Design a protein around this ligand. Structure first.
Ligand SMILES: COc1cn(-c2ccc(N3CCOC3=O)cc2F)nc(-c2ccnn2-c2ccccc2)c1=O
Ligand SMILES: [Mg+2]
Ligand SMILES: [Zn+2]
Length: 315
């Protein structure tokens, strides 16, 4: 499998499109692993990883995303591509180690996702929630990332100094934990206050950590920043997964919250309008304030918000 990946060349017709924030990987399934190699090569250089190890690694990552409706291999590559666009548009800001780490973190950030929220696992005392009390799935995702790195022939970071290795692993760990949306609200609030008071300082590692955290949220949510027909279809996948979780609760006779209740699907457009206003807009707004070149994400997010309004108003 990984051998043919090494041979892959991205078709020229996509070399410019892939650079756009709103690029949709959807029509190109067979190319997804090749697209990740492409993005790594443009962003970190072709000398960054031993090609063979990189290819084994990517195919093992792919193998460890499950066949769930949303948190799947497609989602992984979509999030990685958004991070590619951020990094490419902010060429001076991030170190080589950060760029490598963040691309890998994005590809790995939902590894072995089961289609269940942290809340669900915690409610029912799943072994994963007994192991990881908070940010439950996110600690599992990082754990899975480390397990793949430690497979024979998969250590893409083998040629880093011992110190650079622990550094990148921490970058990756913080970045994946940051994708727990419960942590986003506090992070964005801290960042906003630091901005408005002019105390945000990118020489400060804890500030850098917070910015990266916000970048991770922005990439994770980036389905809301695609062209409307793409965003609309992705909303279908998201609720399919939400509703499957609710179905699991109904199997114990338990009524789930309305977001997870397929009998409540008439509320979806209002649910989206709420989510965009409460979560997505503030996210891309703060991101754009800190990193002005990411503005196309906010613009695209606003466009989709006005689409949901039209749906609600029956236009
Ligand atoms: C109501 O519509 C939506 C609600 N959520 C949502 C999800 C989790 C939490 N959680 C988990 C822990 O703490 C939280 O607050 C709160 C949320 F609002 N996400 C999306 C969305 C749009 C794009 N990606 N995702 C997405 C993000 C994560 C998981 C699934 C989907 C969405 O469209
Ligand atoms: Mg996740
Ligand atoms: Zn995700």
């Amino acid at each position: 499998e990984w051998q043919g990946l090494m041979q892959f060349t991205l078709p020229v017709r996509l070399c410019k499109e892939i650079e756009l924030f709103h690029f949709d990987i959807g029509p190109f399934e067979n190319m997804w692993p090749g697209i990740f190699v492409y993005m790594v090569h443009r962003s970190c250089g072709t000398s960054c990883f031993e090609l063979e190890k990189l290819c084994r690694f990517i195919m093992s990552v792919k193998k460890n995303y499950r066949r769930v409706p949303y948190h799947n291999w497609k989602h992984a590559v979509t999030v990685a591509h958004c991070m590619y666009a951020i990094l490419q548009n902010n060429h001076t800001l991030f170190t080589d180690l950060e760029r490598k780490g963040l691309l890998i973190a994005c590809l790995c950030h939902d590894l072995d996702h089961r289609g269940f929220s942290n809340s669900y696992l915690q409610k029912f005392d799943h072994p994963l929630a007994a192991l990881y009390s908070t940010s439950t799935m996110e600690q599992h995702h990082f754990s899975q990332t480390v397990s793949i790195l430690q497979l024979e022939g998969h250590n893409i970071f083998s040629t880093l100094s011992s110190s650079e290795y622990e550094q990148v692993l921490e970058i990756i760990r913080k970045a994946i934990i940051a994708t727990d949306l419960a942590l986003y609200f506090g992070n964005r609030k801290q960042l906003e206050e630091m901005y408005q008071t002019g105390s945000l300082n990118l020489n400060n590692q804890s500030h850098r950590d917070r910015v990266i955290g916000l970048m991770m949220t922005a990439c994770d949510l980036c389905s809301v920043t695609k062209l409307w027909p793409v965003t609309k279809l992705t909303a279908n996948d998201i609720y399919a997964e939400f509703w499957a979780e609710g179905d699991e609760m109904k199997k114990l006779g338990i009524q789930p919250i309305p977001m997870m209740d397929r009998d409540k699907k008439d509320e979806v457009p209002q649910g989206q309008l709420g989510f965009y206003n409460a979560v997505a807009i503030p996210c891309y707004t703060t991101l754009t304030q800190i990193l002005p070149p990411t503005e196309p994400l906010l613009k695209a997010c606003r466009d989709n918000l006005s689409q949901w309004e039209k749906v609600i108003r029956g236009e």
